[PDB]
Structure 1
Amino acid sequence: SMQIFVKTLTGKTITLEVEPSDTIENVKAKIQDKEGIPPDQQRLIFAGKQLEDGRTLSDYNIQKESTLHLVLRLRGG
């Protein structure tokens, strides 16, 4: 019921449809559905803070049109 943006370190901006009650975990699942990135690779940063999976957008008072920042985990083998 609201739109937020997810900005990458690659010059890409993702638009997501979310609700205040969505957990960060849910937001990551939505990013997976839309963009193909597994949730365990995603870290989401907002206003100098890394957001935690069990918290909701409402917990952080994240308003519509807000921009979250995505940094990927790196794993090599």
Structure 2
Amino acid sequence: MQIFVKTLTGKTITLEVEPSDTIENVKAKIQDKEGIPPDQQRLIFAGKQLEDGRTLSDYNIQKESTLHLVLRLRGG
């Protein structure tokens, strides 16, 4: 399924994911496409910070949803 990741630069990127994927795996996909190290990535959905060990499904993230990406420490 496709999801959107809205960054703070005004760029939105698209990802192909499964609801069984971990949040950790999603951050790896973002590093693959944009080059951002996972430990700099804070992902937010429905007002919740997403935990690396949980899955998209745990958060009820459905197709065509948008996550918000905020960068910490170095990227923020």
Q: What TM bracket, shorter-length normalisation? A: over 0.9
Provide Cα deviations, 1:15-46, integer angstroms capped at 9, x if missing partner: 00000100000000000111100100100000
Give % identity. 100
Considering fraction of residues, name the structure with more helix.
2
TM-score by length of 1: 0.93
**Number of equivalent positions:** 76
- Output the TM-score relative to the length of structure 2: 0.94
Gaps of 5+ in 2: none
1:76, distance to aligned residue in structure 2 (A): 9.3
Separation of aligned partners in 2, 1:63 and 1:21: 11
For residue 13 of structure 2, give the secondary structure of its aligned residue in structure 1.
strand
